Amino acid sequence: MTEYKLVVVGAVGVGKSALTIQLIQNHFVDEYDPTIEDSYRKQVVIDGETCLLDILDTAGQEEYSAMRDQYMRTGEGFLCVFAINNTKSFEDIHQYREQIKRVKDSDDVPMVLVGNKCDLAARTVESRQAQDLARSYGIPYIETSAKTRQGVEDAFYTLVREIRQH
Numbered sequence: 001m002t003e004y005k006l007v008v009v010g011a012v013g014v015g016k017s018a019l020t021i022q023l024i025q026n027h028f029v030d031e032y033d034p035t036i037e038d039s040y041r042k043q044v045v046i047d048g049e050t051c052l053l054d055i056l057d058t059a060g061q062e063e064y065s066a067m068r069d070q071y072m073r074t075g076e077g078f079l080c081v082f083a084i085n086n087t088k089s090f091e092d093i094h095q096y097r098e099q100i101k102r103v104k105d106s107d108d109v110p111m112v113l114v115g116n117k118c119d120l121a122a123r124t125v126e127s128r129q130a131q132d133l134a135r136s137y138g139i140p141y142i143e144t145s146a147k148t149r150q151g152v153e154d155a156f157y158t159l160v161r162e163i164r165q166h
């Protein structure tokens with residue numbers, strides 16, 4: 001096995017836990033809506049390689065977390081999540097990427113920009129705008145819905161591939 005340390009970041013309510021839980025769930029527990037940041041594990045085969053993903057579901061910058069800095073030092077790749085119906089969450093992406101750069105002292109950290117809640121008609125962030133932003137960062141952009149499952153595996157596996165290609 002190869003182990004990957006993934007960190008999910010983004011503003012309050014964008015769907016960080018929903019995404020993480022949807023990926024990692026074994027469905028013994030019907031509904032699980034975590035109230036606190038936590039770490040989860042998932043074994044998956046990605047391109048023939050058996051991967052152990054450790055996924056940290058972080059709190060928004062709005063919440064205090066003592067270990068936030070070490071989380072970013074330990075993290076190998078980051079999913080930067082905003083919601084396509086939440087313009088402020090999109091604008092906040094800059095702050096998450098700056099935090100990661102300040103802590104890791106690097107311009108070249110593996111990351112994927114994730115526009116969540118793509119099941120919703122009430123869109124305020126157009127796909128093209130997010131593609132531009134991801135292009136400016138030199139990272140992939142993937143739209144997801146934790147509710148419909150669209151894009152969820154793709155977002156996480158793309159991040160693993162970014163770590164690999166680093």
Ligand SMILES: Nc1nc2c(ncn2[C@@H]2O[C@H](COP(=O)(O)OP(=O)(O)NP(=O)(O)O)[C@@H](O)[C@H]2O)c(=O)[nH]1
Nearest residue numbers: 011012013014015016017018060116117145146147
């Ligand atoms: N329509 C829709 N709602 C979603 C989606 N993902 C999450 N939600 C909803 O958005 C809300 C916030 O989700 P949650 O998973 O708690 O987000 P979070 O980013 O972990 N929040 P927090 O920062 O407070 O931990 C919940 O009501 C959840 O059901 C999605 O893809 N589509």
Ligand SMILES: [Mg+2]
Nearest residue numbers: 016017018034
């Ligand atoms: Mg959460």
